[PDB]
Design a binder for this molecule. Sequence first.
Ligand SMILES: [Mg+2]
Ligand SMILES: [Mg+2]
Ligand SMILES: [Mg+2]
Ligand SMILES: [Mg+2]
Ligand SMILES: [Mg+2]
Ligand SMILES: [Mg+2]
Ligand SMILES: [Mg+2]
Ligand SMILES: [Mg+2]
Ligand SMILES: [Mg+2]
Ligand SMILES: [Mg+2]
Ligand SMILES: [Mg+2]
Ligand SMILES: [Mg+2]
Ligand SMILES: [Mg+2]
Ligand SMILES: [Mg+2]
Ligand SMILES: [Mg+2]
Ligand SMILES: [Mg+2]
Ligand SMILES: [Mg+2]
Ligand SMILES: [Mg+2]
Ligand SMILES: [Mg+2]
Ligand SMILES: [Mg+2]
Ligand SMILES: [Mg+2]
Ligand SMILES: [Mg+2]
Ligand SMILES: [Mg+2]
Ligand SMILES: [Mg+2]
Ligand SMILES: [Mg+2]
Ligand SMILES: [Mg+2]
Ligand SMILES: [Mg+2]
Ligand SMILES: [Mg+2]
Ligand SMILES: [Mg+2]
Ligand SMILES: [Mg+2]
Ligand SMILES: [Mg+2]
Ligand SMILES: [Mg+2]
Ligand SMILES: [Mg+2]
Ligand SMILES: [Mg+2]
Ligand SMILES: [Mg+2]
Ligand SMILES: [Mg+2]
Ligand SMILES: [Mg+2]
Ligand SMILES: [Mg+2]
Ligand SMILES: [Mg+2]
Ligand SMILES: [Mg+2]
Ligand SMILES: [Mg+2]
Ligand SMILES: [Mg+2]
Ligand SMILES: [Mg+2]
Ligand SMILES: [Mg+2]
Ligand SMILES: [Mg+2]
Ligand SMILES: [Mg+2]
Ligand SMILES: [Mg+2]
Ligand SMILES: [Mg+2]
Ligand SMILES: [Mg+2]
Ligand SMILES: [Mg+2]
Ligand SMILES: [Mg+2]
Ligand SMILES: [Mg+2]
Ligand SMILES: [Mg+2]
Ligand SMILES: [Mg+2]
Ligand SMILES: [Mg+2]
Ligand SMILES: [Mg+2]
Ligand SMILES: [Mg+2]
Ligand SMILES: [Mg+2]
Ligand SMILES: [Mg+2]
Ligand SMILES: [Mg+2]
Ligand SMILES: [Mg+2]
Ligand SMILES: [Mg+2]
Ligand SMILES: [Mg+2]
Ligand SMILES: [Mg+2]
Ligand SMILES: [Mg+2]
Ligand SMILES: [Mg+2]
Ligand SMILES: [Mg+2]
Ligand SMILES: [Mg+2]
Ligand SMILES: [Mg+2]
Ligand SMILES: [Mg+2]
Ligand SMILES: [Mg+2]
Ligand SMILES: [Mg+2]
Ligand SMILES: [Mg+2]
Ligand SMILES: [Mg+2]
Ligand SMILES: [Mg+2]
Ligand SMILES: [Mg+2]
Ligand SMILES: [Mg+2]
Ligand SMILES: [Mg+2]
Lengths: 46, 14, 63, 77, 102, 93
Amino acid sequence: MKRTFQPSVLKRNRSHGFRARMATKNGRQVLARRRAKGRARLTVSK
Amino acid sequence: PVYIPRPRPPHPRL
Amino acid sequence: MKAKELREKSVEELNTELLNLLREQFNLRMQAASGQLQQSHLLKQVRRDVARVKTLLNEKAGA
Amino acid sequence: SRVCQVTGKRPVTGNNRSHALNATKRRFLPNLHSHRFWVESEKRFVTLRVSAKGMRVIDKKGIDTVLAELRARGEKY
Amino acid sequence: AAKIRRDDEVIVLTGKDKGKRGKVKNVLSSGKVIVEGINLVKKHQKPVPALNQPGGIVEKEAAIQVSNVAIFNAATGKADRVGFRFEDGKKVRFFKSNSETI
Amino acid sequence: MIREERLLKVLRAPHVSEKASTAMEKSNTIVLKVAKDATKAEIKAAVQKLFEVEVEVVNTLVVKGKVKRHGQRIGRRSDWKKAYVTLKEGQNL
RNA sequence: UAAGGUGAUAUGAACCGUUAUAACCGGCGAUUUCCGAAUGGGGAAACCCAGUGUGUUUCGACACACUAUCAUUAACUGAAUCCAUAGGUUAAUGAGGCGAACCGGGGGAACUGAAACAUCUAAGUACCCCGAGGAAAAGAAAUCAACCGAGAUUCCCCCAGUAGCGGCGAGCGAACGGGGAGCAGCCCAGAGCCUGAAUCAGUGUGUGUGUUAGUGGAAGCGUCUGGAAAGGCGCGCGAUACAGGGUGACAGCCCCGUACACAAAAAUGCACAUGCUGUGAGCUCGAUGAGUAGGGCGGGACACGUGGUAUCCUGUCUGAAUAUGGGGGGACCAUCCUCCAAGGCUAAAUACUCCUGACUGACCGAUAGUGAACCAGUACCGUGAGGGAAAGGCGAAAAGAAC
RNA sequence: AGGACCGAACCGACUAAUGUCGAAAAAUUAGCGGAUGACUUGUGGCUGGGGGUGAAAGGCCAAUCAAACCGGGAGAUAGCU
RNA sequence: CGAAGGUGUGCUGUGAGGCAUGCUGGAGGUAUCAGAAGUGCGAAUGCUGACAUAAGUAACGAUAAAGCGGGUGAAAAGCCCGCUCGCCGGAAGACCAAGGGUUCCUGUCCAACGUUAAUCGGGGCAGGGUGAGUCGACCCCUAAGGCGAGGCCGAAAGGCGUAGUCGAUGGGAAACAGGUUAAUAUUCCUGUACUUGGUGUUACUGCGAAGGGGGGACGGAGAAGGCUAUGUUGGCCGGGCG
RNA sequence: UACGGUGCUGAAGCAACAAAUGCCCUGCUUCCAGGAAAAGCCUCUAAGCAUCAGGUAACAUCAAAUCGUACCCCAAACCG
Ligand SMILES: [Mg+2]
Ligand SMILES: [Mg+2]
Ligand SMILES: [Mg+2]
Ligand SMILES: [Mg+2]
Ligand SMILES: [Mg+2]
Ligand SMILES: [Mg+2]
Ligand SMILES: [Mg+2]
Ligand SMILES: [Mg+2]
Ligand SMILES: [Mg+2]
Ligand SMILES: [Mg+2]
Ligand SMILES: [Mg+2]
Ligand SMILES: [Mg+2]
Ligand SMILES: [Mg+2]
Ligand SMILES: [Mg+2]
Ligand SMILES: [Mg+2]
Ligand SMILES: [Mg+2]
Ligand SMILES: [Mg+2]
Ligand SMILES: [Mg+2]
Ligand SMILES: [Mg+2]
Ligand SMILES: [Mg+2]
Ligand SMILES: [Mg+2]
Ligand SMILES: [Mg+2]
Ligand SMILES: [Mg+2]
Ligand SMILES: [Mg+2]
Ligand SMILES: [Mg+2]
Ligand SMILES: [Mg+2]
Ligand SMILES: [Mg+2]
Ligand SMILES: [Mg+2]
Ligand SMILES: [Mg+2]
Ligand SMILES: [Mg+2]
Ligand SMILES: [Mg+2]
Ligand SMILES: [Mg+2]
Ligand SMILES: [Mg+2]
Ligand SMILES: [Mg+2]
Ligand SMILES: [Mg+2]
Ligand SMILES: [Mg+2]
Ligand SMILES: [Mg+2]
Ligand SMILES: [Mg+2]
Ligand SMILES: [Mg+2]
Ligand SMILES: [Mg+2]
Ligand SMILES: [Mg+2]
Ligand SMILES: [Mg+2]
Ligand SMILES: [Mg+2]
Ligand SMILES: [Mg+2]
Ligand SMILES: [Mg+2]
Ligand SMILES: [Mg+2]
Ligand SMILES: [Mg+2]
Ligand SMILES: [Mg+2]
Ligand SMILES: [Mg+2]
Ligand SMILES: [Mg+2]
Ligand SMILES: [Mg+2]
Ligand SMILES: [Mg+2]
Ligand SMILES: [Mg+2]
Ligand SMILES: [Mg+2]
Ligand SMILES: [Mg+2]
Ligand SMILES: [Mg+2]
Ligand SMILES: [Mg+2]
Ligand SMILES: [Mg+2]
Ligand SMILES: [Mg+2]
Ligand SMILES: [Mg+2]
Ligand SMILES: [Mg+2]
Ligand SMILES: [Mg+2]
Ligand SMILES: [Mg+2]
Ligand SMILES: [Mg+2]
Ligand SMILES: [Mg+2]
Ligand SMILES: [Mg+2]
Ligand SMILES: [Mg+2]
Ligand SMILES: [Mg+2]
Ligand SMILES: [Mg+2]
Ligand SMILES: [Mg+2]
Ligand SMILES: [Mg+2]
Ligand SMILES: [Mg+2]
Ligand SMILES: [Mg+2]
Ligand SMILES: [Mg+2]
Ligand SMILES: [Mg+2]
Ligand SMILES: [Mg+2]
Ligand SMILES: [Mg+2]
Ligand SMILES: [Mg+2]
């Protein structure tokens, strides 16, 4: 049984990383929402 | 929980 | 070593000491690492002294 | 965009109204064309994307007046 | 400033030691003072083997609220309140009730 | 030429352990906890200046801090750099 | 300002200080790694790789500075192509990104209601996007009124759920006029009569008033119970202070405070007189906003769904008069009245609270009140967007239990 | 030579039994099919919601699919329980 | 000289209730008359926490398998040592990438975790441990693709895209054997190498690029030959003669 | 002896045969479905400099930074 989560750090950062978020107007609104909510981890960047 | 399995199908009273 | 008797000094003797304050700092750090520094306060003291001398350098550097 | 360089006419929005009065969002676009105007003062051709009303405005005024207005607005032509 | 200082003779106003008299040993920022031989607690101290292990039931002073002590006049022989005034430009404490400087 | 104010920051401590003892014993290598920046050239210059010994080569590694659970909180110790400084021939001073 | 102090869990260690560079508090400075608009290029954020210049150099290395893009301005340069322009380089100035609501604008649902549903409603709402400010917007009649008059805009209470609009259904819903809050008017389209002529805008001085640390600040003892007194009992005192909080039980007089009276080296807000800087004063005469008003077609906004539909805005096609002229007065015409579009600026009353302080509550009190009284937007869940807890109380004192 | 043959790896999933609060939210055991190809597989990339992709089953699109998920409109509405 | 609360008792009212009081509790409560309501719970397959029931029941997760002696220990079926036995051996061995992130090694501890015990552990606590010119990344180069100065287009947001710049899963320099730690080793050590640059000295001379050309540089299948890894046997050497 | 291991010494260390799916081989043969790119690399010159610079070749010297490296990795350490 292959499951849905097949981790890959490169794909993770290219898909949801900080620079991926900053690339688009909508990704920068994700960061604004998570900053407003007070999220300790802003992105998947560690 | 977070996952509730679908109940088994009833006997087809058809 | 206060700020009065360091502001009376000059940019060169004051660059001398802060170099030798650093030296002192490195010796105290190695001594504390080996476990021979039974005076923990000397680290904070020489650190604040280095900060003081660098402050006075930034003042004497023009403004 | 579909904006007249002379008059500033741009697409507006309104309704398509059917006979049953069904309203549908629609756009009214300006009658835009790219046209080379002969600037005699500059002895050259300047291409502007203008509506037909903009062409009428350039006929009424001069192309020099309209180009001065564009420059005042800061629009590059 | 503070009305009760370190090397200051005080009398206890409240508690088991009411009326007892001693001198302050140190002032705690929590608003409590340690007075010599006043608030004696019996502490069951574990025999720490590292430095020295007398262990035993030691008799320590416990902090007492500064509210609960007043400085002793020794001229009127009773508890007295403290005001502040300026003599020679310097702020000094004086007693109320025979307003002499401390 | 690395400046002495930088050399006096490069070195942090000597690293005391069984492997460090064995290294100084039978390979003439002193083990140091150095700064994090701490290039090999900076470490060599600093050892040769401050310990006034003759350095052959510097091997460096970064030690990643351990995740420790102090009380009921998850903490992590800082990463630090370790330098194996091989002295040339004579001896430590 | 000070006799204590070296932030907390959190004790120790090593020390600092006690009469004025211990600490603490405030002003002004300094320092301020890396990432991030991130801006030298790149990048899987907190990393990788540079170029140029200056300086140092134990000679091979080091330090610092600069190097993004766009807009505007300027200088130089510069093609096809003669000039020229495009383009290029450099320099200066500005912007960029973030932020809770309020504001203006560009777009813009559907659920739902209509007991179905399509016109209609929801609703110009949610939401997306752009932009600004401390408020914004609007704003000095081509406005109303009704032969009487009012006199910019905005906001509140009426008018009035009225007149109307409306598958005349569900629903939507004014204005006129009145009472208030607050009021403020100007400028260009222009030439001559004066040449910092009132203002206005930025600077420097002062004065006053705050603000950012602070200072002083009254007056209670005895006895009973009690572990402890602030409680009871008795006798006193202060009060421009009996707000509040703490202290071993409930304290005006134990403490911190409170009323009250003072305080600022420095920075700073406001108010006022100013000293410079710049435009501009007032008078005469003139001018007085054209692809515009209006029209046709299609839409939208007006309470008003095209209706008999005025008015406004426009995508499209047209197109005046120009003050012996034109707009409006709810189809339209005549008369009369009233105003002067096609150029702009403008405070106040009005909106909101990310945030600061003080105060308040017939608000909650740990399943409540914020999700979060507690190391909570955490643990944990999810690829991600995102979702999202539980968990307070020993005692007065740790005296937290030697043996 | 060959979408040739038999048959491991590998990729599948025809039958049966077990399991069905499982060892497992799809398996195990015994057999079974393809196994040089229209094959299989690693890494990276692209296509997105009335959209994608589909040797087509309305299949698949993160254990979710006749319109994914998250947040919002939103306390939709509910003559029903 | 004992509040609220809790827990009994007695009395009392038509009822919701009330009153008194013992014990607990240890600091609050509140008449009366008015006033306001988050004002009364058994149900909503209600929500949260706690605790039952089934029940000391099913199960303890591959039917590869254990036995014994000694040790340690409070305690040994499970740990350590030993001797047997059994199981895998195209793996159930070894080395990596991905992913994880200290699980590695040592000492110590056994509460919780481990489907039992545990002295043991990938568990707790503390300490140690990762050494590179040559391995990899970084770096140079590019693919798919991404971004993209200007540009073109688009109500806005933005879309596409040129120059360019990124982007490996591909191309591009170089290290081997032996030894060594409790834990690293092509990194440490020993021995023996190699590569690419910089700077000098010397000698001889045309060098010079965002440009040209070559090269890099490439499919499937098949067959054979030559080899080697590797194995077998013999020889040799050491040991044995059961 | 910590009886876990530590230290010292150390013979022979050859041949034949067999043999890969590994290497020669990015070869060869054949087929059609006709099988990356760019750089490093070699070479050629342009402008430009030709004494210089630069290139080539010896020898010498210097440098080669930084980051990863433990451990699991058909697994009790990854996804379930
Ligand atoms: Mg992806
Ligand atoms: Mg080495
Ligand atoms: Mg390394
Ligand atoms: Mg950048
Ligand atoms: Mg810069
Ligand atoms: Mg940068
Ligand atoms: Mg780069
Ligand atoms: Mg901005
Ligand atoms: Mg509808
Ligand atoms: Mg309906
Ligand atoms: Mg209905
Ligand atoms: Mg502002
Ligand atoms: Mg305004
Ligand atoms: Mg009149
Ligand atoms: Mg009808
Ligand atoms: Mg005071
Ligand atoms: Mg007082
Ligand atoms: Mg009490
Ligand atoms: Mg005019
Ligand atoms: Mg019109
Ligand atoms: Mg009309
Ligand atoms: Mg018209
Ligand atoms: Mg009109
Ligand atoms: Mg009219
Ligand atoms: Mg006019
Ligand atoms: Mg206007
Ligand atoms: Mg709560
Ligand atoms: Mg409670
Ligand atoms: Mg076949
Ligand atoms: Mg198979
Ligand atoms: Mg299938
Ligand atoms: Mg089957
Ligand atoms: Mg077959
Ligand atoms: Mg077969
Ligand atoms: Mg893939
Ligand atoms: Mg079907
Ligand atoms: Mg699925
Ligand atoms: Mg649908
Ligand atoms: Mg939803
Ligand atoms: Mg709604
Ligand atoms: Mg509902
Ligand atoms: Mg109460
Ligand atoms: Mg009892
Ligand atoms: Mg209720
Ligand atoms: Mg009921
Ligand atoms: Mg219930
Ligand atoms: Mg149960
Ligand atoms: Mg039971
Ligand atoms: Mg049973
Ligand atoms: Mg049974
Ligand atoms: Mg059983
Ligand atoms: Mg079993
Ligand atoms: Mg088992
Ligand atoms: Mg045994
Ligand atoms: Mg067993
Ligand atoms: Mg651990
Ligand atoms: Mg282990
Ligand atoms: Mg262990
Ligand atoms: Mg036990
Ligand atoms: Mg157990
Ligand atoms: Mg462990
Ligand atoms: Mg490409
Ligand atoms: Mg693009
Ligand atoms: Mg652009
Ligand atoms: Mg590249
Ligand atoms: Mg690669
Ligand atoms: Mg890369
Ligand atoms: Mg190992
Ligand atoms: Mg050329
Ligand atoms: Mg061989
Ligand atoms: Mg061999
Ligand atoms: Mg043999
Ligand atoms: Mg023999
Ligand atoms: Mg094969
Ligand atoms: Mg030369
Ligand atoms: Mg040579
Ligand atoms: Mg390893
Ligand atoms: Mg291992």
